[PDB]
Amino acid sequence: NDDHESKLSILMDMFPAISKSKLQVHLLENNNDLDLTIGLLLKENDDKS
Amino acid sequence: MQIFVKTLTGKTITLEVESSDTIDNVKSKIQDKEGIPPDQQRLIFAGKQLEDGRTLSDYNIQKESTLHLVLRLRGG
């Protein structure tokens, strides 16, 4: 890690609902990847019910 | 009316669009300015990429909305 915080910031604004905790967790595991992580997150918000 | 287009990297672009326009139109204009393929660029908003050819009314997009754009090429 060196400058993932900036990417994390993008995530905060990218998803006005996801808790910072979750953003940090997924980000860390996915080797600080935005394209892949976010890509999956996009579909997640398909529909509540 | 105009909506902001913030990039994953760090760059926002203002694009004029009618309330009853279409997301697809936005993608086209953005492509014209930067010159990035629509397929590559991901127009994310409200925690999800906006569907091409959809009126703002559906998503209820306000004015000067900060739409995020993530390039598919390279990155992860």
mmCIF file of C-alpha atoms in Angstrom, chain A residues 1-8 24 27-28 31-32:
data_model
loop_
_atom_site.group_PDB
_atom_site.id
_atom_site.type_symbol
_atom_site.label_atom_id
_atom_site.label_comp_id
_atom_site.label_asym_id
_atom_site.label_seq_id
_atom_site.Cartn_x
_atom_site.Cartn_y
_atom_site.Cartn_z
ATOM 1 C CA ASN A 1 0.000 0.000 0.000
ATOM 2 C CA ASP A 2 1.228 3.505 -0.841
ATOM 3 C CA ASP A 3 -1.599 5.557 -2.361
ATOM 4 C CA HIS A 4 -4.721 3.388 -2.266
ATOM 5 C CA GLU A 5 -6.469 5.989 -0.097
ATOM 6 C CA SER A 6 -7.079 8.068 -3.223
ATOM 7 C CA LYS A 7 -8.757 5.081 -4.857
ATOM 8 C CA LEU A 8 -10.695 4.473 -1.651
ATOM 9 C CA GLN A 24 -11.535 -0.762 2.729
ATOM 10 C CA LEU A 27 -10.135 -2.863 -1.716
ATOM 11 C CA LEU A 28 -7.353 -4.411 0.379
ATOM 12 C CA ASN A 31 -4.974 -5.848 -4.410
ATOM 13 C CA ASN A 32 -6.364 -2.294 -4.384
#
